[PDB]
Structures are given as C-alpha cells and as structure tokens.
Amino acid sequence: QRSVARMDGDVIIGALFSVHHQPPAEKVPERKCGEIREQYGIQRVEAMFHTLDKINADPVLLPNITLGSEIRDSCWHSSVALEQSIEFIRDSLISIRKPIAGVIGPGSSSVAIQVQNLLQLFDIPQIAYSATSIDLSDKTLYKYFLRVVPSDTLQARAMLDIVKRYNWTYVSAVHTEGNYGESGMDAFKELAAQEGLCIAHSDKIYSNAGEKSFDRLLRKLRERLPKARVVVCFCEGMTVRGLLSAMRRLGVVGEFSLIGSDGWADRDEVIEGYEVEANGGITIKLQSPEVRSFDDYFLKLRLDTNTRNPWFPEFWQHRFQCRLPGHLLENPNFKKVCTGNESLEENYVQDSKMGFVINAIYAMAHGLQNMHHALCPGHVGLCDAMKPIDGRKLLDFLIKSSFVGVSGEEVWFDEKGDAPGRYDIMNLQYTEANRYDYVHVGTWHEGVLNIDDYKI
Amino acid sequence: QRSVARMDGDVIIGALFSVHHQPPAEKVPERKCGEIREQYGIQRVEAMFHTLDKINADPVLLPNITLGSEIRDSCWHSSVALEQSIEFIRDSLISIRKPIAGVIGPGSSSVAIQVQNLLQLFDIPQIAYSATSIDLSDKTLYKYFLRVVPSDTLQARAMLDIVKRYNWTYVSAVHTEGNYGESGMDAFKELAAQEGLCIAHSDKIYSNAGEKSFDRLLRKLRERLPKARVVVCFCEGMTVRGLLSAMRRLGVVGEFSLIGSDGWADRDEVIEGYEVEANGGITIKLQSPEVRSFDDYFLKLRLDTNTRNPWFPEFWQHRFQCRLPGHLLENPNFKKVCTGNESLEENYVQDSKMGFVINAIYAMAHGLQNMHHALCPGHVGLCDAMKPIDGRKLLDFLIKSSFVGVSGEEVWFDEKGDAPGRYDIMNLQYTEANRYDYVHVGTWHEGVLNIDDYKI
Ligand SMILES: *[C@@H]1O[C@H](CO)[C@@H](O)[C@H](O)[C@H]1NC(C)=O
C-alpha cells in the first residue's frame, strides 16, 4: 500500500530514493516514515525521471530500447529499503513465468549494505551515488555493488596527503560514530600508521549527543596539546559543529586547527555563528558541479501536469505550506490554500550530490547498451539473449563500462566497483568583506595533491 | 502457485522441508522441482504437524498459546528455498499493517546459508537440524542461525579421542575434497598436532574420482606402512567405499585400521560387498534414536482424514504406484487404482534424522515460552510485548534455552548457536549370521569418550 513511481519501458531501471525522512525511533516496527523530502527525495525522483527522458531521446545511446524505471521510497532506512527491495525481487521472480534490471540507490552506506546483501542474492546489480563506506569495496561480501562515487579510503587518503604536505607529526583523531565515521577513520588510522604519522589523542562521538558528551571530548583534546595540535575529524557535519559549541562554552578559540571530511565540507549550515571557533579549518568537499539541465526541468514542474510522480501533490503542499480543494492527499495541516501557480524558485537549491545521482543512472544505461552490443549484435531492439536480462552478465558488464561524466568528467569503475576520487580542498577564512567564507584552495585528483599554498 | 502446508495458531513457526527433489540441471531457472520425497519430505512435514500437536497438548509448554506453522517446499535448492523464504518475509512485512516467528530448516548447509543470509536481513531466527558445515558458526556472517545438532568440527575431537584411547602414535590422513572434508580434517590435523599425535601419510580425493585416482591413493597409503597403520578418514560415504574398491583390485586385505567420520557412519550402503575389505573400521555415527511416537502417527495416516498436508495425495499415489479416480490431484503415470487403504508400513523406514527435526521445533517452542515468561509476566496468553514478536529478542532468547531432548538427551546452545556432541562409536565386525553388522560399541558425550573396550 506504499506509493510507487513508475515509468514503463523495455528495460526497467529500479531505484531507491529517500522520498520521506526515516520513521521515528518508536515507529520503526510498523515502518511508518516521517515528513517528505525535496533534496534527497522529490528532486532525485524527478532527476531519474528526467535523466531517463534525456536518454530515450539520445539517438546514439540505447537507440531503440526505451529505459523505464520503478522508483521506490527508501525512507533512508534499512527497515524500509529492504521492505521495498523485497518487492523488486518478488515482482522480478514473477515476470519470469516486468522485471527490474538493476537498482540505483540507496543513499546511505549503512543501508546500501542491507540492500546489497539482499539484492546480491538475486543477481541484481546495484549502483550507488553517495555510499562511500569502504566496506562496500569487499567484493567477497558485496559482489553486485558499485558506485559512480569514490570510496572513503580515497578520502582518508586526501586528508592524510594534506597532513603530509604540511610537515605535521602528531594529529588528534575525532570522528563521528557509526559507519561513515568508523569506515573513513579506520582507513586513515591505518593509512596513517604506514606513512609514519603518529596519532596523538583519539576519540569518537555521536552527532546527536548532549553538550556534556562534547565538553568531555573537548577537554581530552586540549589536554593532549601541544602535540595534539592538528585534529583530524572524519566527522559528520554536526559532530564538528557540536565540537565548536564545546569551544564556545569553554571560551577557548584558536587552540586547534581542523581537517574535516565531506561531512563538514563547505556547509554554512555547520559553522553557523561559530564562524570564529571553526575558522581556518580545512575541509574536503566532493567534486560535483550543479547540473545545468535539471534546474530547467524540476522548476517548470506543475501540480496538474506531472502525472508520473504520485508524491508531488504531497510534496507541493508541504513545499508551499498550503492545502487543496479536497483532493485525495489533501494535507489538512495547513491554513492557506495552494494556488497551484506558486513558483518552485523561492529558496530553490538543487540537490548537491544531484550530479552523481544522474551519472549512476547513465552507468546503468551504458552498462545495458554494452550488454546489448555483445549479446545482440546487429540486432536493433532486444534479442532473446536479453529477454530476460542476465544478472551476473549485466554486472561484470557494468563494471567494464566507461562514459563521459555529466560534467565532462570521465567515468569508469575499477575491479572492486569503486570510482575515481576527485576532491576539493576547502578552507574557512577571513576574506575582504565582513564574511567568513569557504575558500577553494586546492584539489585532489586521485593521488595528486594540488594546493595553492599562498591562498591559505 | 506452489502448494503450502498451513496450520493456524497464535505464533506461527515457519519451516522449509525438501518435499520434492531438486529441479533437474537445466530447469533450475524456471524452478520446477522433481519427484516427491518421503524421508526428507512428507515425513518431516508430517513430523512438524505432529510435533506441533503434542506441544499444543502439553499443559506446561505454552499453556494458552497455540503453535501453528507454515511449511514450504525447499526442493533442496537455494534457488527455491530462497523463492519461498522471500514469501515468509513478504507476508511478514504485511501483517504488520499472520507473520512468521522463526524458521525450522532448510536441510542442506549450502542452502541454509542462502536462507540465513536472507532470513537474517529481517531478524528472523533460523533453527537447523542437519546443516553441519562449520561456516555457519561464524556469527558475524550468520547471526540468526542455530541448530540442534553439532558442527562437523566436534567430530574431529571424538575421532582423535578415539585415537588417544588406544595409545596410537602414527596415523594416515585421508579425507574427501570439498567443504566437508577440509573443514573436519583441518580441525583434526590441528587438534592432533596439539595432543602430540604425529601425522604419517596425508592425502585428499574427490568421491566421484576414477578407480585410477584411488589406486594411486591406496599405493601411497601402503608405502608409508608400518607406521601409517591407522588411517583417519574424514571422508564422505563413497570416498571410503572408493578406497575399499582400491583394496579389492590390489587384492589386499585389512592391513589398515580405519577410523571414519559420519560420512561413513553405519551405512550398509557404503560397505556393500566390500564387507571384508573394510571389516573392523571404527566410525562415528550421530546419536539419533528413532522416535517412538512419530511412527504411530505417520502410519495411521489416512488419505481422507489428513487434510492439512496438501502433498499427501501426490505422495500417496507415488508411494503405492497407483492413481486416484477423478481427483484434483489424480496422477496419470500409474496403471492400477489406489485402494486408498494400502498400508504405509510396507518397507517403512522412519527418517534417520527424524529425531533432530523434532528437537528443532521444540527449541523454537521453548524459545517462545521463555520470551513469554520474561516479557509477558502476569499474562497467560500473548501480551502487547509479543504482538508482534521481536526478532533479535526471540533469538538471543532461543540461544539461552535448555530442554529435555526428544530422547532424554540434553539440549542447549553455545554462544555461536551450535549444539553439543553426541557421536556413537560404530565398529564393523562379524556377529552371528552371514551378516557383517555395524556394532554399537561406544559414545562421545561432549568430551567424554566411553568405549566398551571388550565389545571391539
Ligand atoms: C487457559 O487454558 C486452561 C486450560 O488449558 C483454562 O483452564 C483457562 O481458563 C484458560 N485461560 C483463559 C483466560 O481462557
């Protein structure tokens, strides 16, 4: 009885997008998810629909084979993503006596693991756009998993190389608790122990922990000075902020210099106010420019034209805070009544990772093209060898795929299913105006550390 | 589409039994299974129905909580067992908005792995009765898996202890190639290197290898005499037999003293004709007395009073090679009509592991009782804490369970989910008629070797 986004075709690409936030702590059992999401949700849904459209128009790629998809809501939770993934498979097992060819998603690593653990049973390839856990690289455990996104070892790598470039010997190690935290640090600690660096103080904390928890963290960090000067935070955007708040109450400022992972990146949202305590820090952003195209598509979207996305109505009302002349999903919660002509441009922000989400889809497309070229030579449409499509076949076939990234970037996969790492080094500093801004100071292109030393 | 055995209750225990043989080599894709099975199938089906009945009758075990089950056909194949297992979960996810509480089965280890890999993703405990492979003990990989029978490893300890009891210094090491062979031997070879024993000659061979392969094995074994006097075979049934055939052509006779694993056990099948080449060997059987009760129940089964087993009709006709006039399940292959009241005794042989299959069920029962005693205090029936039942909770619960085996035997589980050792020491010798009979000469109850020395 949960909603599903469908668009028909010859080969159906199935995706898992966090359309709604995850179910509240106590409702997980009955699997009723929370409020709707635009960035990690409605956009990506529309992104897939859109992308898939551009492709059915490209006369070069997948000529007379239409790509269709079935998009399900992951609610950013294993509990549900699995609930849905089952259905991918249930349905598939049936149209064998339309089936899924592969799956784009899910967004979280800790979840993509669950999806992969289930999806791999049934020879369904899985391409991910933001799952950076480094456990996924173990192809003995996650054989049918790949990503259009780099692995996090590559990030502990770039962070270490940053620590290397500046002749540093002792660095504190703080990271967010969980998978994102452990994975990366586990790779830094080790990648570090090799290159020589001696890890000074080492701690771990939950992003949603009390001020008490952080204060205890800040103390410990300070006590290990002056060696524990450089703190390396493989931390979630808020683990950092939390650490800054601990610096506010303790009134210390300028004691620590930081190096943070894409959890922090160049988000204003993290150093809000705390511009000072969190100044001069260096962070890793993810290399990915906003898609020219998508913006033009996701904005001229109307409440009465969009026929394929059953969530729009819900979304739309939540996005403008208003309720309709009755409907089926009339969201009562509101006092105002939608005109239906509101503009999606007020406070519009394209999904950050939005670039990746598309690459992923393409890989799934390209993968199919190649499978076709080899298994149906000369043939224009789909031949008996791809009716139905073979899992393990499409898999190694996706692995051996290369295409022009959504932004003139090159895209391919190594033997483990990972992607090449292109990072951006960010530094927080005082410019000319009254602004504390994130200044781009360097790049990391697979092993190549480029820092404009004079810009820091 | 595929039939399912269903008995309603308050907590539904799900089971996977090989009702049919596995689908022929080339039909696996469409998943159509072969001929019906009585021992590994109809009996166990009936065994579960039966057992569950005695438990709904026991005044003490689950007083006002009826145990029900849903029994599905595994066809002794991953392809299908998974197909069905999905349904356990499909259904289960649904009643959350009747669900499975746990699963008895499957039969094979290589399969139980697939079932466990899927069943674990949804917090469904899994109790197995004949899956003995060692890998399942890794709880980091098969967290929700346990059994009421020991691992293969245990065996080694008992085989070695047998070697220890007789003051032997040099033994030959032969075993089957594959999962079984390597596992056990790997544990012997090591358990042996500790206790002191010096491994003389050491070899490994495939059960389905040519007479050439074995002859080469036999030679090598002999050459290492008189030290390589005691050969320790951690071998499948036929690996042994094959070795006997090698002794026939080379015309040699009992130069060796064999010690074989449950692959050989007390199977007449293995020493067919070669009663002489192999007479005297010592083997390890798995203690499993026949169930008094079951026999009485399975035999008085009428084709018209037994409605809960949908397979009976099919089975019945295949068991007596006759058809049933105008039936919804009338078989055409046969020539003469079924009297309907043929006797199920002609050549009746109770399932060998039939004892285990029941223990398993009980554990699932007992497990539930305890979760009830702990979580529904004051309530006689099921309380909101068990509506629905919690996976991870029932599981570690099951673990901490202990009950009187179906045959006085004690039953519990260690922290990995494995069961206690209960090997029976069989020796082949000449008794009273022209029968070479396996004679029971000793037991191994977790570390305790007991051999009636005078009986050998
Ligand atoms: C529970 O079952 C027993 C007999 O099996 C009966 O005496 C008792 O009344 C039952 N309890 C309830 C609440 O019905």
Side-chain angles (χ1 to χ4, degrees), chain B residues 184-217:
Chain B
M185 189 59 97
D186 268 54
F188 186 73
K189 277 211 188 80
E190 188 194 300
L191 224 178
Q194 291 186 196
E195 286 293 69
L197 187 72
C198 276
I199 288 306
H201 182 65
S202 165
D203 216 305
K204 79 173 171 180
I205 177 176
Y206 257 165
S207 289
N208 41 73
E211 299 185 357
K212 289 268 295 184
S213 305
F214 277 127
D215 288 310
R216 196 175 187 285
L217 165 58

Side-chain angles (χ1 to χ4, degrees), chain A residues 158-178:
Chain A
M159 287 174 99
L160 182 67
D161 289 314
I162 274 182
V163 189
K164 284 217 79 174
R165 175 85 32 173
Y166 286 7
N167 269 312
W168 283 318
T169 48
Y170 289 74
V171 295
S172 290
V174 184
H175 64 76
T176 305
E177 244 265 55

Side-chain angles (χ1 to χ4, degrees), chain A residues 1-2 29-31 82-83 86-87 89-90 93-94 96-97 114 117-118 121-122, chain B residues 1 29-31 82-83 86-87 89-90 93-94 96-97 114 117-118 121-122 141:
Chain A
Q1 56 161 293
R2 195 191 292 295
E30 42 181 63
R31 287 187 314 284
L82 285 173
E83 181 186 73
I86 283 301
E87 290 302 311
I89 296 151
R90 184 208 287 190
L93 289 179
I94 304 301
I96 298 297
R97 317 150 85 198
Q114 300 296 68
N117 276 151
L118 171 66
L121 297 183
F122 302 106
Chain B
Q1 281 271 276
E30 35 184 67
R31 282 191 314 285
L82 285 173
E83 182 188 71
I86 284 295
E87 291 300 312
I89 295 151
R90 184 207 279 199
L93 293 176
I94 297 303
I96 304 295
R97 316 152 87 196
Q114 300 296 67
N117 275 154
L118 172 65
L121 301 182
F122 295 111
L141 238 159

Side-chain angles (χ1 to χ4, degrees), chain B residues 90-332:
Chain B
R90 184 207 279 199
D91 286 1
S92 262
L93 293 176
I94 297 303
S95 262
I96 304 295
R97 316 152 87 196
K98 214 172 295 65
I100 297 302
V103 177
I104 305 293
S108 186
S109 289
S110 63
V111 178
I113 259 60
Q114 300 296 67
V115 167
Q116 169 68 189
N117 275 154
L118 172 65
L119 276 199
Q120 77 179 189
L121 301 182
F122 295 111
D123 298 338
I124 291 173
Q126 184 189 317
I127 302 173
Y129 46 45
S130 51
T132 29
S133 182
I134 258 92
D135 311 317
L136 274 151
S137 289
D138 199 357
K139 283 309 94 153
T140 73
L141 238 159
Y142 304 125
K143 197 180 233 179
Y144 279 77
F145 173 99
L146 54 171
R147 18 175 155 179
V148 276
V149 50
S151 181
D152 292 324
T153 280
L154 271 215
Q155 228 145 288
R157 186 63 205 169
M159 288 176 99
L160 182 67
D161 288 314
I162 274 181
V163 192
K164 279 218 80 174
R165 172 87 31 173
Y166 288 5
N167 273 310
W168 285 316
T169 48
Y170 284 78
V171 294
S172 284
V174 182
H175 65 76
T176 293
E177 199 169 348
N179 184 308
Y180 182 98
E182 282 197 291
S183 71
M185 189 59 97
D186 268 54
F188 186 73
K189 277 211 188 80
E190 188 194 300
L191 224 178
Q194 291 186 196
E195 286 293 69
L197 187 72
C198 276
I199 288 306
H201 182 65
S202 165
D203 216 305
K204 79 173 171 180
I205 177 176
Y206 257 165
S207 289
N208 41 73
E211 299 185 357
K212 289 268 295 184
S213 305
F214 277 127
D215 288 310
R216 196 175 187 285
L217 165 58
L218 189 47
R219 290 198 307 232
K220 277 292 183 182
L221 271 180
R222 280 189 55 189
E223 292 172 9
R224 299 302 303 278
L225 271 168
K227 293 185 176 183
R229 177 167 176 71
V230 175
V231 171
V232 182
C233 218
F234 214 121
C235 308
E236 281 177 49
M238 248 39 113
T239 286
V240 169
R241 180 193 188 80
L243 176 58
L244 297 171
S245 193
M247 299 183 105
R248 179 70 73 185
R249 279 185 296 294
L250 187 57
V252 300
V253 191
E255 290 190 70
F256 299 119
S257 311
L258 296 182
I259 302 188
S261 44
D262 74 310
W264 182 348
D266 64 319
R267 320 173 56 193
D268 323 280
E269 14 280 73
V270 177
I271 54 168
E272 186 81 307
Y274 296 84
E275 281 102 36
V276 285
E277 322 277 37
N279 155 221
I282 294 189
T283 61
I284 298 310
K285 188 187 74 182
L286 199 45
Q287 231 201 181
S288 207
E290 40 178 47
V291 184
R292 227 292 176 187
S293 172
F294 177 72
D295 269 17
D296 298 320
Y297 163 73
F298 174 71
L299 284 157
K300 301 175 180 59
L301 282 178
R302 290 189 55 46
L303 183 54
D304 79 78
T305 77
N306 171 57
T307 77
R308 60 183 166 201
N309 177 344
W311 293 295
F312 218 68
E314 176 184 6
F315 154 63
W316 189 278
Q317 309 195 82
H318 174 266
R319 163 59 122 73
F320 302 140
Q321 304 240 84
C322 59
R323 53 216 224 76
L324 296 167
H327 202 289
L328 335 174
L329 308 170
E330 181 185 10
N331 186 302

Side-chain angles (χ1 to χ4, degrees), chain A residues 32-311:
Chain A
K32 191 264 194 183
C33 316
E35 222 177 62
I36 213 179
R37 292 177 71 154
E38 180 191 340
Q39 274 80 193
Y40 287 78
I42 300 295
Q43 296 204 74
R44 289 176 185 181
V45 168
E46 295 295 327
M48 166 136 233
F49 273 146
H50 176 63
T51 303
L52 279 168
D53 266 329
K54 207 163 161 176
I55 285 178
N56 294 325
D58 190 318
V60 204
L61 170 48
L62 273 178
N64 287 64
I65 298 184
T66 59
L67 286 181
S69 80
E70 180 169 295
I71 303 179
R72 281 156 186 288
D73 179 9
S74 65
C75 286
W76 203 271
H77 201 191
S78 317
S79 66
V80 161
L82 285 173
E83 181 186 73
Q84 297 293 291
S85 280
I86 283 301
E87 290 302 311
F88 276 131
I89 296 151
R90 184 208 287 190
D91 285 1
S92 269
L93 289 179
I94 304 301
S95 270
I96 298 297
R97 317 150 85 198
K98 215 171 295 64
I100 297 301
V103 177
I104 304 295
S108 187
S109 289
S110 64
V111 179
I113 259 59
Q114 300 296 68
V115 167
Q116 169 68 188
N117 276 151
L118 171 66
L119 277 198
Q120 83 174 185
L121 297 183
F122 302 106
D123 297 339
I124 294 172
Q126 186 187 318
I127 302 171
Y129 49 42
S130 53
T132 31
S133 169
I134 31 168
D135 309 311
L136 275 150
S137 289
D138 193 1
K139 286 302 96 152
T140 74
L141 241 157
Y142 304 124
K143 197 180 234 178
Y144 279 77
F145 177 95
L146 55 168
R147 27 200 174 177
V148 289
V149 135
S151 93
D152 263 2
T153 264
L154 287 198
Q155 171 156 189
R157 187 58 189 158
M159 287 174 99
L160 182 67
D161 289 314
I162 274 182
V163 189
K164 284 217 79 174
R165 175 85 32 173
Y166 286 7
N167 269 312
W168 283 318
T169 48
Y170 289 74
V171 295
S172 290
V174 184
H175 64 76
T176 305
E177 244 265 55
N179 193 291
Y180 173 85
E182 281 197 291
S183 73
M185 189 60 96
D186 268 53
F188 184 75
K189 276 207 187 88
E190 191 194 298
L191 223 179
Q194 295 184 191
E195 286 294 69
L197 188 76
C198 280
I199 288 307
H201 182 66
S202 169
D203 217 302
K204 82 174 171 178
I205 178 177
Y206 257 166
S207 294
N208 41 73
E211 299 185 356
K212 289 268 294 183
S213 304
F214 278 127
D215 288 310
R216 196 175 187 284
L217 165 59
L218 189 48
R219 291 198 307 232
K220 276 292 183 182
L221 273 177
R222 280 190 57 188
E223 291 172 8
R224 299 300 304 277
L225 274 165
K227 297 184 172 182
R229 188 165 170 69
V230 178
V231 169
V232 182
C233 216
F234 215 122
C235 308
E236 209 171 338
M238 234 57 81
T239 287
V240 168
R241 180 193 189 80
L243 176 58
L244 298 171
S245 192
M247 299 183 108
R248 179 70 73 185
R249 280 184 297 293
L250 187 58
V252 315
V253 178
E255 263 182 336
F256 296 122
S257 214
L258 299 179
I259 302 187
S261 43
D262 74 309
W264 182 348
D266 64 319
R267 317 167 62 189
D268 315 285
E269 21 274 71
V270 174
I271 55 175
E272 186 77 307
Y274 294 86
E275 279 97 42
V276 183
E277 359 277 300
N279 183 295
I282 295 188
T283 62
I284 315 289
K285 180 174 61 183
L286 254 162
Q287 197 150 169
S288 198
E290 66 164 29
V291 184
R292 225 295 175 186
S293 174
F294 178 72
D295 270 17
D296 298 319
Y297 164 72
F298 173 73
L299 278 159
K300 301 173 176 65
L301 276 183
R302 275 185 80 67
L303 196 55
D304 53 30
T305 57
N306 191 57
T307 60
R308 40 194 189 182
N309 182 341
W311 292 297

